[PDB]
Swiss-Prot record:
Similarity section: Belongs to the glycosyl hydrolase 22 family.
Name of the protein: Lysozyme C
Pfam families membership: Lys
Catalytic residues as annotated in Swiss-Prot or TrEMBL: 35, 53
Reaction catalysis annotation: Hydrolysis of (1->4)-beta-linkages between N-acetylmuramic acid and N-acetyl-D-glucosamine residues in a peptidoglycan and between N-acetyl-D-glucosamine residues in chitodextrins
Domain (C-type lysozyme) ranges: 1-130
GO cellular component: azurophil granule lumen; extracellular exosome; extracellular region; extracellular space; specific granule lumen; tertiary granule lumen
Record-linked SMART domains: LYZ1 (SM00263)
Disulfide bond sites: 6-128, 30-116, 65-81, 77-95
Function: Lysozymes have primarily a bacteriolytic function; those in tissues and body fluids are associated with the monocyte-macrophage system and enhance the activity of immunoagents.
InterPro entries: Glyco_hydro_22, Glyco_hydro_22_CS, Glyco_hydro_22_lys, Lysozyme-like_dom_sf
Biological source species: Homo sapiens
Keyword Signal in record: yes
Recorded disease: Amyloidosis, hereditary systemic 5: A form of hereditary systemic amyloidosis, a disorder characterized by amyloid deposition in multiple tissues resulting in a wide clinical spectrum. AMYLD5 primarily affects the viscera, and the predominant clinical features are renal dysfunction of varying severity, and intra-abdominal bleeding. Inheritance is autosomal dominant.
Length: 130
């Protein structure tokens, strides 16, 4: 499913992402936007290390979910990567929360650093009623 911007914002708020581990909703919005364009079925194969990024937040199979085919992987979120391709983002949000519980926080995603850090991200939540 490809979410509309405000529909996603409200969904994430309900799922408790606003201020999760000090990260504002607008940051999560910025992250989903650049990682998948709000698309839950997005997948990106990293030929370089044989890992794959899954879902709306592009969560990597080397550390967070199990896809069986990634060498040297762990499944820190303890989920099948298949769970990150559902239209219902409940599992993807639980996985994203697990990723930020590590010391790096939101910086774990390089796209966040490039596209959201030290930027005016209010644009992502404007007019959504959140």
């Amino acid at each position: 499913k490809v979410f509309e911007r405000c529909e996603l914002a409200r969904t994430l708020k309900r799922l408790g992402m606003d201020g999760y581990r000090g990260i504002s909703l607008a940051n999560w919005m910025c992250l989903a936007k650049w990682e998948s364009g709000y698309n839950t079925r997005a997948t990106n194969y990293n030929a370089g290390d044989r890992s794959t990024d899954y879902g709306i937040f592009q969560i990597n199979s080397r550390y967070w979910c199990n896809d069986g085919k990634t060498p040297g992987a762990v499944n820190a979120a303890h989920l099948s990567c298949s769970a990150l391709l559902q239209d219902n983002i409940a599992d993807a949000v639980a996985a994203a929360k697990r990723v930020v519980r590590d010391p790096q926080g939101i910086r774990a995603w390089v796209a966040w650093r490039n596209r959201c850090q030290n930027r005016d991200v209010r644009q992502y939540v404007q007019g959504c009623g959140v």
